[PDB]
Swiss-Prot record, chain B:
Enzyme Commission (EC) number: 2.7.7.85
GO molecular function: adenylate cyclase activity; ATP binding; diadenylate cyclase activity
Function text: One of 3 paralogous diadenylate cyclases (DAC) in this bacteria, catalyzing the condensation of 2 ATP molecules into cyclic di-AMP (c-di-AMP). Upon expression in E.coli leads to c-di-AMP synthesis. Probably the main producer of c-di-AMP for the cell; is probably implicated in control of peptidoglycan synthesis. In B.subtilis c-di-AMP is a second messenger that mediates growth, DNA repair and cell wall homeostasis; it is toxic when present in excess.
Protein family membership: Belongs to the adenylate cyclase family. DacA/CdaA subfamily.
Activity modulation notes: DAC activity is stimulated about 20-fold in E.coli by coexpression with CdaR.
Keyword annotations of the record: ATP-binding, Cell membrane, Membrane, Nucleotide-binding, Nucleotidyltransferase, Transferase, Transmembrane, Transmembrane helix
Induction: Constitutively expressed, part of the cdaA-cdaR-glmM-glmS operon.
EC class name: transferase
Location relative to the cell: Cell membrane
Organism name: Bacillus subtilis (strain 168)
Catalytic activity line of the entry: 2 ATP = 3',3'-c-di-AMP + 2 diphosphate
The protein's name: Cyclic di-AMP synthase CdaA
């Protein structure tokens, strides 16, 4: 169906962008809104309401650029905003080597049903935050399965 | 002070902030503003964005060595319609010979549309505008803003 094709296109754009950033160890934070509305967080960023592309996602997260400091929030198959605030988790159960990107991802996952993707700037490692837990060192296939699920 | 007028003023402020930033950093850029001649055929050659304008997004688009930096951004009213778009190259003899493909593309689109195109040189940081087949170079910040305001 058109809806199914569009979802698969979006997943492909995301995974391509994440793979490129993982290879270059570009830190990134990408939250996908689900049933819990995230408007209050979207409003803290720079509005985009842009079509998804791997190219635009990569251009957003380039280091030392206006848009790379904060989270991208995606909603209804569009990039709603960039450079958004997310709340920092106070969980004591996050790997101690991780810093504020990962804590922000976990934090938003504590209070919403959203899925957040994190690329580490230290390692290029890819992780996902959902339900207050962080799933670390994901393969490409693992990330795709989480997005399909 | 209608909403349309205020939106235009916010868009002009975003463009001029981005162009000033890129000029200072010698970030090459090529930004075409559609007017009454539709540019769909050119917009369709790029990556679709259909994005709200911001100075931040414009700057990010043109950072060197990134996916979206080569080719034109085409704006439709208060949106960035597409990036990395193809524009036709002018063969005009009035294009300074030292200028590269971005300036020739800008003049080229300006020969077949009523659009206004802004160019930032990666060599000098100089700002130029192409309109109606003519290239106007070395614009001050004030002159660019006045040209945008008049357009
Ligand atoms: C298809 C899915 C992963 C999605 N990505 O951004 C969205 O708004 N939905
Ligand atoms: Mg002069």
């Amino acid at each position: 169906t058109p809806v199914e094709e569009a979802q698969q296109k979006t997943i492909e754009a995301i995974t391509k962008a994440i793979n490129y950033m993982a290879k270059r160890r570009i830190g990134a934070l990408l939250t996908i809104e689900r049933d819990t509305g995230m408007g209050d967080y979207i409003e803290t960023g720079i509005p985009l309401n842009a079509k998804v592309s791997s190219e635009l996602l990569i251009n957003i997260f380039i280091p030392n650029t206006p848009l790379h400091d904060g989270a991208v929030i995606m909603k209804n198959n569009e990039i709603a905003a960039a450079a958004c605030y997310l709340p920092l988790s106070e969980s004591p159960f996050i790997s101690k080597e991780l810093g504020t990107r990962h804590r922000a991802a976990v934090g938003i996952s504590e209070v919403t049903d959203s899925l957040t993707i994190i690329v580490s700037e230290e390692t290029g490692g890819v992780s996902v935050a959902k339900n207050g837990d962080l799933h670390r060192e994901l393969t490409e296939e693992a990330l795709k399965e989480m997005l399909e699920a």
